[PDB]
Amino acid sequence: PKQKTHRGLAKRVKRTGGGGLKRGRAFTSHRFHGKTKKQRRQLRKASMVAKGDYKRIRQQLARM
Amino acid sequence: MKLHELKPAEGSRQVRNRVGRGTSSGNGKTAGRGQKGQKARSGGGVRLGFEGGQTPLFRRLPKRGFTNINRKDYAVVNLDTLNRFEDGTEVTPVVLKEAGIVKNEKAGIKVLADGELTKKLTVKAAKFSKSAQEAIEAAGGSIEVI
Amino acid sequence: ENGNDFAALSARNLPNVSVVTSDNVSVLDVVSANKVLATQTALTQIEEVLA
RNA sequence: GUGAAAUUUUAGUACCUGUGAAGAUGCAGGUUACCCGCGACAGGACGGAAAGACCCCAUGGAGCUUUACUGUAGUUUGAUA
RNA sequence: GGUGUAGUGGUAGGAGAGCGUUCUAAGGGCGUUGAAGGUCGAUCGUGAGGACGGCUGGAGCGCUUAGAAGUGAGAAUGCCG
RNA sequence: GUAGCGGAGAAAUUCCAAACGAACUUGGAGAUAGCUGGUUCUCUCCGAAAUAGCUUUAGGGCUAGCCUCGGAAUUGAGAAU
RNA sequence: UAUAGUUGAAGGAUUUGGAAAAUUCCGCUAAAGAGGGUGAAAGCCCCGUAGACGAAAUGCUGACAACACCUAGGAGGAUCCUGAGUACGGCGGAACACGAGAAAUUCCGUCGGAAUCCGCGGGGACCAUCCCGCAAGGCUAAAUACUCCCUAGUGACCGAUAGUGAACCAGUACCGUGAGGGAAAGGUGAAAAGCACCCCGGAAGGGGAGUGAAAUAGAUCCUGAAACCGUGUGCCUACAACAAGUCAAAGCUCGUUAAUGAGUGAUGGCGUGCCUUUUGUAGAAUGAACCGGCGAGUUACGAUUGCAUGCGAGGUUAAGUCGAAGAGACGGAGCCGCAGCGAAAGCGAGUCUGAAUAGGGCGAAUGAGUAUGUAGUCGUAGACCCGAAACCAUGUGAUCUAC
């Protein structure tokens, strides 16, 4: 049959123009009294997926 | 070519690897699998993306956004592609098709200015960026959103 | 060529001979034979379909 | 006269003191010993028979208990036909 | 092709290049003046392996090039004899 | 006559066709087993690990570290004094 | 048209054999050189094949006839009709890819319960407006699924431990109260010509003589491997502690694919099997009595990388139609690539964040793809093979034992 994509990954990630994967950040929904303003200012910028994670993740997102 | 002297091209066919056929081949006795463990069993292995029991990377990250149901995507053609027409032609979505430049015009054509025109066209399309229309009109033609 | 049926009947059954019409030549028919004996009409008909 | 069995890597299958997966017929150094059998005894072959029943594990089972969780047959109480 | 210099222990495992079995196609062959199979020999190659000769045997079988695989056995307290 | 989510028991977890903490037969069924056993031809080149971190994790796994094959790249980035 | 049938071309000698279809000469035939048989391998010997011909009877399928049924316009808009315990709503369940969810639509149980063309339902809670339909009555060919069976065939499918469990009198013998479980076992020769007669012996069996190309092809019958059991001989062996060989070597006995020959060997040096699992094994850790046969990374569909070929800012068709189960043309729905950024509205070689033209993120700046073949890895499927204790759902047992 066909391969099924991981529907939980696809709701969380997107594919950039040179093949990468933009991602959101953690520690960004919850107790902000436990973290500094500089931390929460700098946890507002997106990032990318690392090479260890991508090697193990590649096949689940092949089609979207 | 005669049917008793066939020859494929070099590098085009390779043979095959058969495991479990003696020691000297390199892959007898456990056939490349190492010693014991879950990965040495028939049907052994863990599912894709599994990580032991640590919280998997998809599950620490938050979800994001929504899909719009009235989304419009267009079928860009820039400015070099309008150089393969004669000086004065009235380029249009049916003359773009039937040259194969555009097949599958999603929600209509949109012209983009990247980067250089020298013709006398009169372009008919659904959308124009500010610089596409501009450079089209410098070279000496006209636009009409339709 | 075509409904040249007397010729195809006469040429059957000879153990060195194969018979094909001009709308039904394959790659394997031409490679296996040593020669081709084609009529003038059939030659133009082949030139019409290979174009 | 008739006629099995469990067992079995191949065997021309000694003793002492050592060595060694730390208790050797088979390895070292010695000592003893012509070749082939019969009737008897059980010290060794970690002798044979039974992939330890003792102990721990498998995110194994199964039977049992209850003020462990989540359900339910049965019994009861109200509304409505 | 010559000549120099350097190298060539190996378990898990990666990479290369080959030997042999059965069947398909095309080509060129052998066979009751004896095919396959079996048995013996003091033969050849760096290895898997290849020939030639005797005896047995009685009807089928090699070689070249390409293709396809139920394609190689010493072990599972394996299964049948 | 009483039948397996069952029967029968002067009560022993006792009996229900030489086996009963839940009979026998067929099917789901090639149940599942992070465990144990086995896995069949040849030569040439290279050649590990037995560690860190996280883990209902500790004889399993994942990412890094350590092996092998193919490419790219400015160098004079590597080593030993 | 199905179910019996008819007719159907063309060869002799020679060599080797028991026997030719083989060999060598010289001929003929083909709308027939597909296949099977015959004392070995046949276009021309036999049965057939290509082509031509045929049905008393019964059954099927067409066509055209009869017979049976069914089917008309224009206008009016006074009034009447158009499927009721129904649509629908509350409560409880289920079906829709949709797990109560913001839950439209379709069903079942229970209770409540419309309107009538100035009407009624739907467009995914709900309302208004616009648009598309007219429930609560019935039937209907084809295009799609399957093969116990009959005819005609096909296979880079098996060839007697294979292929059906079963090539043979097989669901048999055998096992169980029963439901149920379930095998082993093919081959003389061209032709039985299958050994008349004699001799030893109760017979079995054997030796002659005969058959036959061959009997060491004699019915336990083609070939006839190994384990295992014997008989005969060249060389060694009764003072010797041996994982059984290997290297050195006198004597004896032979004489080969002819070369730095072959068998045996007193005596001397050295030397703790094979496999598995282990930090580590001769292991007193694990497996194997021996010999033979069988017995384990495969395929389908997807995803990715390397190699190879054709086209190249492009590449390529799917289902389907004609065609020999084929090649070999039609078919452009569709798929990938050619532009990105942003949650989105959107903007575009740029865009998002931002008051910012600042800075920063991701992109551009000549920067190659696509179809197919082949090999390496992965996913879904039993997915390299063998191995539980158990769980569930139909059925069969009180001829033993308990009451």
mmCIF file of C-alpha atoms (C1' of nucleotides) in Angstrom, chain G residues 58-378:
data_model
loop_
_atom_site.group_PDB
_atom_site.id
_atom_site.type_symbol
_atom_site.label_atom_id
_atom_site.label_comp_id
_atom_site.label_asym_id
_atom_site.label_seq_id
_atom_site.Cartn_x
_atom_site.Cartn_y
_atom_site.Cartn_z
ATOM 1 C "C1'" U G 58 -33.334 -32.889 -29.143
ATOM 2 C "C1'" G G 59 -31.792 -28.389 -27.073
ATOM 3 C "C1'" C G 60 -30.037 -22.913 -27.674
ATOM 4 C "C1'" U G 61 -29.392 -17.920 -30.125
ATOM 5 C "C1'" G G 62 -30.821 -14.273 -34.020
ATOM 6 C "C1'" A G 63 -34.043 -12.152 -37.790
ATOM 7 C "C1'" C G 64 -39.226 -11.110 -39.624
ATOM 8 C "C1'" A G 65 -44.681 -12.074 -39.011
ATOM 9 C "C1'" A G 66 -49.006 -12.481 -36.123
ATOM 10 C "C1'" C G 67 -51.127 -11.903 -31.562
ATOM 11 C "C1'" A G 68 -51.012 -8.991 -27.025
ATOM 12 C "C1'" C G 69 -50.254 -4.394 -24.361
ATOM 13 C "C1'" C G 70 -48.706 1.421 -23.747
ATOM 14 C "C1'" U G 71 -48.622 6.356 -25.694
ATOM 15 C "C1'" A G 72 -52.193 13.085 -28.196
ATOM 16 C "C1'" G G 73 -52.651 19.370 -28.494
ATOM 17 C "C1'" G G 74 -54.001 24.555 -27.353
ATOM 18 C "C1'" A G 75 -56.820 27.921 -23.139
ATOM 19 C "C1'" G G 76 -58.640 29.238 -18.323
ATOM 20 C "C1'" G G 77 -57.088 30.019 -13.277
ATOM 21 C "C1'" A G 78 -63.599 30.251 -9.490
ATOM 22 C "C1'" U G 79 -63.004 26.024 -6.551
ATOM 23 C "C1'" C G 80 -61.099 20.733 -5.185
ATOM 24 C "C1'" C G 81 -56.336 17.009 -5.065
ATOM 25 C "C1'" U G 82 -50.886 15.880 -4.566
ATOM 26 C "C1'" G G 83 -48.832 9.476 0.549
ATOM 27 C "C1'" A G 84 -50.290 11.822 9.389
ATOM 28 C "C1'" G G 85 -49.404 9.464 14.744
ATOM 29 C "C1'" U G 86 -45.970 11.068 9.380
ATOM 30 C "C1'" A G 87 -41.916 15.189 9.123
ATOM 31 C "C1'" C G 88 -40.164 17.122 13.478
ATOM 32 C "C1'" G G 89 -38.654 17.911 19.021
ATOM 33 C "C1'" G G 90 -36.811 16.098 24.405
ATOM 34 C "C1'" C G 91 -34.288 11.513 26.579
ATOM 35 C "C1'" G G 92 -31.097 6.915 25.491
ATOM 36 C "C1'" G G 93 -28.128 4.276 21.782
ATOM 37 C "C1'" A G 94 -25.983 3.526 16.931
ATOM 38 C "C1'" A G 95 -24.351 4.846 11.311
ATOM 39 C "C1'" C G 96 -21.843 8.483 8.600
ATOM 40 C "C1'" A G 97 -13.584 8.867 7.553
ATOM 41 C "C1'" C G 98 -16.416 12.410 11.723
ATOM 42 C "C1'" G G 99 -14.579 8.852 19.493
ATOM 43 C "C1'" A G 100 -20.534 14.742 21.709
ATOM 44 C "C1'" G G 101 -17.971 17.600 19.736
ATOM 45 C "C1'" A G 102 -19.667 24.224 17.762
ATOM 46 C "C1'" A G 103 -22.448 18.685 15.264
ATOM 47 C "C1'" A G 104 -25.598 19.487 10.001
ATOM 48 C "C1'" U G 105 -27.263 14.470 7.406
ATOM 49 C "C1'" U G 106 -29.322 8.939 8.060
ATOM 50 C "C1'" C G 107 -31.403 4.924 11.444
ATOM 51 C "C1'" C G 108 -33.499 2.165 15.924
ATOM 52 C "C1'" G G 109 -36.450 2.293 21.274
ATOM 53 C "C1'" U G 110 -39.457 5.613 24.260
ATOM 54 C "C1'" C G 111 -42.511 9.923 25.130
ATOM 55 C "C1'" G G 112 -44.504 14.562 22.948
ATOM 56 C "C1'" G G 113 -46.292 16.110 18.090
ATOM 57 C "C1'" A G 114 -47.151 20.124 12.244
ATOM 58 C "C1'" A G 115 -48.437 22.782 7.720
ATOM 59 C "C1'" U G 116 -51.178 22.483 2.816
ATOM 60 C "C1'" C G 117 -48.761 26.028 -2.947
ATOM 61 C "C1'" C G 118 -50.107 33.082 0.807
ATOM 62 C "C1'" G G 119 -47.033 25.663 1.284
ATOM 63 C "C1'" C G 120 -42.899 22.197 2.540
ATOM 64 C "C1'" G G 121 -37.322 20.354 2.641
ATOM 65 C "C1'" G G 122 -31.837 21.202 1.863
ATOM 66 C "C1'" G G 123 -26.917 24.411 0.897
ATOM 67 C "C1'" G G 124 -22.436 20.980 8.171
ATOM 68 C "C1'" A G 125 -24.785 24.673 15.133
ATOM 69 C "C1'" C G 126 -28.385 29.073 14.412
ATOM 70 C "C1'" C G 127 -30.961 33.511 11.829
ATOM 71 C "C1'" A G 128 -32.081 36.741 7.421
ATOM 72 C "C1'" U G 129 -31.681 36.953 2.068
ATOM 73 C "C1'" C G 130 -30.742 34.353 -2.524
ATOM 74 C "C1'" C G 131 -30.268 29.446 -5.099
ATOM 75 C "C1'" C G 132 -31.383 24.045 -5.960
ATOM 76 C "C1'" G G 133 -35.311 20.389 -5.131
ATOM 77 C "C1'" C G 134 -40.853 18.271 -3.849
ATOM 78 C "C1'" A G 135 -40.263 13.201 1.548
ATOM 79 C "C1'" A G 136 -43.567 10.087 4.522
ATOM 80 C "C1'" G G 137 -46.087 4.385 -2.319
ATOM 81 C "C1'" G G 138 -44.073 0.190 -6.067
ATOM 82 C "C1'" C G 139 -40.805 -1.949 -10.006
ATOM 83 C "C1'" U G 140 -36.489 -2.045 -13.616
ATOM 84 C "C1'" A G 141 -31.515 -4.490 -18.483
ATOM 85 C "C1'" A G 142 -26.267 -3.330 -18.871
ATOM 86 C "C1'" A G 143 -21.379 -2.031 -17.507
ATOM 87 C "C1'" U G 144 -19.070 -5.152 -11.638
ATOM 88 C "C1'" A G 145 -18.186 -10.327 -8.138
ATOM 89 C "C1'" C G 146 -17.537 -15.881 -8.035
ATOM 90 C "C1'" U G 147 -16.314 -21.492 -10.327
ATOM 91 C "C1'" C G 148 -18.708 -27.506 -7.678
ATOM 92 C "C1'" C G 149 -18.945 -28.716 -13.006
ATOM 93 C "C1'" C G 150 -18.427 -29.670 -19.097
ATOM 94 C "C1'" U G 151 -15.607 -28.636 -23.709
ATOM 95 C "C1'" A G 152 -10.649 -26.737 -26.110
ATOM 96 C "C1'" G G 153 -6.098 -25.242 -24.824
ATOM 97 C "C1'" U G 154 -1.580 -22.699 -22.243
ATOM 98 C "C1'" G G 155 3.050 -22.437 -18.802
ATOM 99 C "C1'" A G 156 11.922 -19.460 -18.593
ATOM 100 C "C1'" C G 157 5.069 -24.492 -13.162
ATOM 101 C "C1'" C G 158 6.342 -30.232 -10.180
ATOM 102 C "C1'" G G 159 8.623 -34.918 -11.777
ATOM 103 C "C1'" A G 160 7.559 -40.163 -6.946
ATOM 104 C "C1'" U G 161 10.800 -37.250 0.682
ATOM 105 C "C1'" A G 162 8.411 -33.083 -5.312
ATOM 106 C "C1'" G G 163 3.402 -32.169 -7.234
ATOM 107 C "C1'" U G 164 -3.223 -32.779 -4.350
ATOM 108 C "C1'" G G 165 -3.687 -36.009 1.884
ATOM 109 C "C1'" A G 166 -4.114 -39.497 -2.279
ATOM 110 C "C1'" A G 167 0.210 -41.040 -10.003
ATOM 111 C "C1'" C G 168 -0.945 -47.561 -7.083
ATOM 112 C "C1'" C G 169 -8.758 -50.095 -5.325
ATOM 113 C "C1'" A G 170 -7.153 -43.129 -0.261
ATOM 114 C "C1'" G G 171 -10.333 -40.225 3.056
ATOM 115 C "C1'" U G 172 -8.460 -46.459 2.404
ATOM 116 C "C1'" A G 173 -5.485 -49.595 6.303
ATOM 117 C "C1'" C G 174 -4.680 -47.884 11.053
ATOM 118 C "C1'" C G 175 -5.862 -44.923 15.868
ATOM 119 C "C1'" G G 176 -10.284 -43.022 19.178
ATOM 120 C "C1'" U G 177 -16.681 -44.215 23.109
ATOM 121 C "C1'" G G 178 -17.218 -40.136 20.042
ATOM 122 C "C1'" A G 179 -16.661 -35.567 17.507
ATOM 123 C "C1'" G G 180 -12.231 -36.298 14.961
ATOM 124 C "C1'" G G 181 -6.972 -37.612 13.411
ATOM 125 C "C1'" G G 182 -4.656 -40.431 9.029
ATOM 126 C "C1'" A G 183 -0.421 -42.956 6.216
ATOM 127 C "C1'" A G 184 3.139 -46.202 3.364
ATOM 128 C "C1'" A G 185 3.470 -48.081 -1.403
ATOM 129 C "C1'" G G 186 5.638 -45.849 -9.612
ATOM 130 C "C1'" G G 187 9.898 -48.391 -13.583
ATOM 131 C "C1'" U G 188 11.736 -56.734 -16.481
ATOM 132 C "C1'" G G 189 12.016 -56.628 -21.936
ATOM 133 C "C1'" A G 190 11.202 -54.245 -28.518
ATOM 134 C "C1'" A G 191 8.276 -58.504 -27.936
ATOM 135 C "C1'" A G 192 6.563 -63.070 -22.233
ATOM 136 C "C1'" A G 193 9.880 -65.031 -26.232
ATOM 137 C "C1'" G G 194 8.474 -65.478 -18.013
ATOM 138 C "C1'" C G 195 13.586 -70.780 -18.181
ATOM 139 C "C1'" A G 196 10.790 -77.400 -21.989
ATOM 140 C "C1'" C G 197 14.486 -81.311 -20.266
ATOM 141 C "C1'" C G 198 18.300 -83.148 -16.628
ATOM 142 C "C1'" C G 199 20.960 -83.284 -11.776
ATOM 143 C "C1'" C G 200 21.358 -82.300 -5.738
ATOM 144 C "C1'" G G 201 17.451 -81.539 -2.347
ATOM 145 C "C1'" G G 202 10.872 -82.940 1.749
ATOM 146 C "C1'" A G 203 10.663 -78.107 -0.017
ATOM 147 C "C1'" A G 204 13.027 -73.438 -0.551
ATOM 148 C "C1'" G G 205 17.273 -72.561 -3.319
ATOM 149 C "C1'" G G 206 21.014 -73.790 -6.726
ATOM 150 C "C1'" G G 207 24.077 -75.908 -11.091
ATOM 151 C "C1'" G G 208 23.748 -77.208 -16.416
ATOM 152 C "C1'" A G 209 20.800 -76.795 -20.996
ATOM 153 C "C1'" G G 210 17.925 -73.425 -23.412
ATOM 154 C "C1'" U G 211 15.119 -67.746 -24.700
ATOM 155 C "C1'" G G 212 17.117 -63.214 -25.624
ATOM 156 C "C1'" A G 213 21.295 -57.858 -28.529
ATOM 157 C "C1'" A G 214 22.180 -58.357 -22.912
ATOM 158 C "C1'" A G 215 19.896 -62.725 -17.444
ATOM 159 C "C1'" U G 216 25.445 -59.994 -12.767
ATOM 160 C "C1'" A G 217 17.670 -57.754 -17.538
ATOM 161 C "C1'" G G 218 14.610 -63.840 -13.797
ATOM 162 C "C1'" A G 219 9.824 -60.965 -11.286
ATOM 163 C "C1'" U G 220 12.703 -58.503 -3.789
ATOM 164 C "C1'" C G 221 13.454 -57.785 -11.737
ATOM 165 C "C1'" C G 222 16.332 -50.008 -15.262
ATOM 166 C "C1'" U G 223 20.605 -47.485 -13.051
ATOM 167 C "C1'" G G 224 22.485 -49.501 -8.262
ATOM 168 C "C1'" A G 225 25.933 -44.285 -4.062
ATOM 169 C "C1'" A G 226 27.098 -44.370 1.385
ATOM 170 C "C1'" A G 227 26.630 -46.375 6.351
ATOM 171 C "C1'" C G 228 27.055 -51.590 7.818
ATOM 172 C "C1'" C G 229 28.606 -57.176 7.205
ATOM 173 C "C1'" G G 230 32.114 -60.682 4.880
ATOM 174 C "C1'" U G 231 36.168 -63.558 1.915
ATOM 175 C "C1'" G G 232 41.422 -63.307 -0.295
ATOM 176 C "C1'" U G 233 46.110 -60.990 -0.152
ATOM 177 C "C1'" G G 234 51.533 -56.859 -0.519
ATOM 178 C "C1'" C G 235 53.602 -54.480 3.951
ATOM 179 C "C1'" C G 236 53.585 -53.823 9.834
ATOM 180 C "C1'" U G 237 52.608 -55.622 14.831
ATOM 181 C "C1'" A G 238 53.033 -59.589 21.664
ATOM 182 C "C1'" C G 239 58.745 -54.153 26.988
ATOM 183 C "C1'" A G 240 54.339 -50.926 25.367
ATOM 184 C "C1'" A G 241 50.936 -44.877 27.937
ATOM 185 C "C1'" C G 242 48.929 -43.277 21.648
ATOM 186 C "C1'" A G 243 43.039 -35.910 20.068
ATOM 187 C "C1'" A G 244 45.726 -40.933 16.396
ATOM 188 C "C1'" G G 245 48.190 -36.867 12.756
ATOM 189 C "C1'" U G 246 52.335 -34.002 10.974
ATOM 190 C "C1'" C G 247 57.754 -33.368 9.831
ATOM 191 C "C1'" A G 248 62.584 -36.704 9.482
ATOM 192 C "C1'" A G 249 63.535 -41.921 7.935
ATOM 193 C "C1'" A G 250 66.018 -47.719 7.078
ATOM 194 C "C1'" G G 251 63.906 -52.250 5.186
ATOM 195 C "C1'" C G 252 60.393 -54.808 2.129
ATOM 196 C "C1'" U G 253 56.729 -54.718 -2.268
ATOM 197 C "C1'" C G 254 55.421 -52.638 -6.787
ATOM 198 C "C1'" G G 255 55.925 -49.831 -11.660
ATOM 199 C "C1'" U G 256 52.256 -44.419 -13.194
ATOM 200 C "C1'" U G 257 47.906 -38.940 -16.758
ATOM 201 C "C1'" A G 258 56.396 -40.067 -16.635
ATOM 202 C "C1'" A G 259 57.911 -37.078 -12.691
ATOM 203 C "C1'" U G 260 62.293 -34.284 -8.135
ATOM 204 C "C1'" G G 261 57.197 -42.039 -8.990
ATOM 205 C "C1'" A G 262 53.305 -45.512 -5.859
ATOM 206 C "C1'" G G 263 51.864 -48.719 -1.134
ATOM 207 C "C1'" U G 264 53.545 -49.998 3.827
ATOM 208 C "C1'" G G 265 56.532 -48.657 7.476
ATOM 209 C "C1'" A G 266 60.651 -50.033 12.641
ATOM 210 C "C1'" U G 267 62.560 -45.910 15.049
ATOM 211 C "C1'" G G 268 63.106 -40.026 16.476
ATOM 212 C "C1'" G G 269 61.142 -34.568 17.226
ATOM 213 C "C1'" C G 270 56.497 -31.775 17.864
ATOM 214 C "C1'" G G 271 51.350 -31.774 19.067
ATOM 215 C "C1'" U G 272 44.810 -31.148 24.640
ATOM 216 C "C1'" G G 273 38.741 -32.829 18.458
ATOM 217 C "C1'" C G 274 34.444 -29.795 15.802
ATOM 218 C "C1'" C G 275 30.421 -26.303 16.820
ATOM 219 C "C1'" U G 276 27.813 -22.778 19.941
ATOM 220 C "C1'" U G 277 27.895 -19.052 23.937
ATOM 221 C "C1'" U G 278 31.677 -16.316 26.581
ATOM 222 C "C1'" U G 279 36.044 -11.502 30.237
ATOM 223 C "C1'" G G 280 37.895 -16.276 29.567
ATOM 224 C "C1'" U G 281 37.234 -23.071 27.093
ATOM 225 C "C1'" A G 282 40.816 -29.399 26.017
ATOM 226 C "C1'" G G 283 36.755 -28.236 28.949
ATOM 227 C "C1'" A G 284 34.500 -31.895 34.493
ATOM 228 C "C1'" A G 285 29.997 -25.611 30.259
ATOM 229 C "C1'" U G 286 26.347 -26.751 25.028
ATOM 230 C "C1'" G G 287 24.866 -30.010 20.688
ATOM 231 C "C1'" A G 288 25.594 -34.296 17.446
ATOM 232 C "C1'" A G 289 25.295 -42.810 17.228
ATOM 233 C "C1'" C G 290 26.519 -43.123 11.995
ATOM 234 C "C1'" C G 291 25.238 -42.644 6.563
ATOM 235 C "C1'" G G 292 21.727 -40.597 2.736
ATOM 236 C "C1'" G G 293 17.646 -37.105 1.381
ATOM 237 C "C1'" C G 294 14.891 -32.699 2.812
ATOM 238 C "C1'" G G 295 15.409 -28.270 5.665
ATOM 239 C "C1'" A G 296 16.109 -20.667 6.794
ATOM 240 C "C1'" G G 297 16.413 -12.433 4.128
ATOM 241 C "C1'" U G 298 11.260 -13.944 -0.523
ATOM 242 C "C1'" U G 299 7.321 -11.198 -3.233
ATOM 243 C "C1'" A G 300 3.521 -7.218 -3.918
ATOM 244 C "C1'" C G 301 2.866 -2.082 -3.146
ATOM 245 C "C1'" G G 302 5.143 2.645 -1.383
ATOM 246 C "C1'" A G 303 9.650 5.933 0.231
ATOM 247 C "C1'" U G 304 14.872 7.245 -0.311
ATOM 248 C "C1'" U G 305 20.102 6.971 -2.205
ATOM 249 C "C1'" G G 306 24.029 5.237 -5.900
ATOM 250 C "C1'" C G 307 24.754 3.507 -10.998
ATOM 251 C "C1'" A G 308 22.804 3.355 -16.260
ATOM 252 C "C1'" U G 309 19.881 5.073 -20.716
ATOM 253 C "C1'" G G 310 16.254 8.744 -23.453
ATOM 254 C "C1'" C G 311 14.524 13.668 -23.604
ATOM 255 C "C1'" G G 312 15.831 18.533 -21.380
ATOM 256 C "C1'" A G 313 13.146 24.382 -18.775
ATOM 257 C "C1'" G G 314 11.101 20.783 -19.155
ATOM 258 C "C1'" G G 315 9.805 15.245 -18.410
ATOM 259 C "C1'" U G 316 5.756 11.613 -18.532
ATOM 260 C "C1'" U G 317 1.118 9.337 -19.336
ATOM 261 C "C1'" A G 318 -3.456 6.201 -15.909
ATOM 262 C "C1'" A G 319 -8.026 3.654 -16.597
ATOM 263 C "C1'" G G 320 -9.711 2.306 -21.201
ATOM 264 C "C1'" U G 321 -10.313 1.026 -27.161
ATOM 265 C "C1'" C G 322 -8.271 -2.156 -31.520
ATOM 266 C "C1'" G G 323 -4.244 -6.200 -31.212
ATOM 267 C "C1'" A G 324 -1.691 -13.386 -30.718
ATOM 268 C "C1'" A G 325 -2.748 -13.867 -22.870
ATOM 269 C "C1'" G G 326 2.561 -10.334 -27.142
ATOM 270 C "C1'" A G 327 4.644 -4.368 -28.987
ATOM 271 C "C1'" G G 328 2.203 -1.123 -30.541
ATOM 272 C "C1'" A G 329 -0.652 2.752 -31.860
ATOM 273 C "C1'" C G 330 -4.570 6.077 -29.684
ATOM 274 C "C1'" G G 331 -5.718 8.332 -25.007
ATOM 275 C "C1'" G G 332 -3.119 14.861 -21.477
ATOM 276 C "C1'" A G 333 -8.047 13.600 -16.514
ATOM 277 C "C1'" G G 334 -3.672 13.655 -13.673
ATOM 278 C "C1'" C G 335 1.652 13.745 -11.390
ATOM 279 C "C1'" C G 336 6.613 16.049 -10.633
ATOM 280 C "C1'" G G 337 9.749 20.384 -11.814
ATOM 281 C "C1'" C G 338 10.204 25.610 -13.292
ATOM 282 C "C1'" A G 339 9.639 31.101 -6.503
ATOM 283 C "C1'" G G 340 9.449 32.215 -2.157
ATOM 284 C "C1'" C G 341 7.949 34.163 2.668
ATOM 285 C "C1'" G G 342 3.811 34.319 6.436
ATOM 286 C "C1'" A G 343 -0.748 31.227 11.466
ATOM 287 C "C1'" A G 344 -3.693 33.841 8.077
ATOM 288 C "C1'" A G 345 -5.558 38.223 5.119
ATOM 289 C "C1'" G G 346 -1.916 38.649 1.567
ATOM 290 C "C1'" C G 347 2.715 40.469 -0.901
ATOM 291 C "C1'" G G 348 6.354 38.592 -4.557
ATOM 292 C "C1'" A G 349 12.928 38.348 -5.918
ATOM 293 C "C1'" G G 350 11.584 39.261 -1.894
ATOM 294 C "C1'" U G 351 8.919 38.486 2.585
ATOM 295 C "C1'" C G 352 7.833 38.004 8.076
ATOM 296 C "C1'" U G 353 8.630 40.363 12.872
ATOM 297 C "C1'" G G 354 8.770 45.567 14.038
ATOM 298 C "C1'" A G 355 6.874 52.560 15.110
ATOM 299 C "C1'" A G 356 11.558 51.711 12.108
ATOM 300 C "C1'" U G 357 13.931 52.472 5.448
ATOM 301 C "C1'" A G 358 17.145 49.716 11.957
ATOM 302 C "C1'" G G 359 18.731 44.730 13.153
ATOM 303 C "C1'" G G 360 17.677 39.744 12.670
ATOM 304 C "C1'" G G 361 14.995 34.834 10.544
ATOM 305 C "C1'" C G 362 13.952 32.183 5.924
ATOM 306 C "C1'" G G 363 14.709 32.909 0.533
ATOM 307 C "C1'" A G 364 16.964 34.906 -4.582
ATOM 308 C "C1'" A G 365 21.376 36.307 -6.946
ATOM 309 C "C1'" U G 366 23.727 30.780 -14.082
ATOM 310 C "C1'" G G 367 23.169 27.180 -9.758
ATOM 311 C "C1'" A G 368 18.322 20.939 -13.425
ATOM 312 C "C1'" G G 369 14.791 18.052 -13.683
ATOM 313 C "C1'" U G 370 11.776 14.002 -15.164
ATOM 314 C "C1'" A G 371 10.389 8.773 -16.961
ATOM 315 C "C1'" U G 372 12.189 3.837 -16.929
ATOM 316 C "C1'" G G 373 15.754 -0.268 -15.759
ATOM 317 C "C1'" U G 374 19.167 -2.191 -11.982
ATOM 318 C "C1'" A G 375 21.340 -2.767 -6.971
ATOM 319 C "C1'" G G 376 21.707 -1.147 -1.280
ATOM 320 C "C1'" U G 377 18.427 0.225 3.107
ATOM 321 C "C1'" C G 378 13.593 1.304 5.278
#
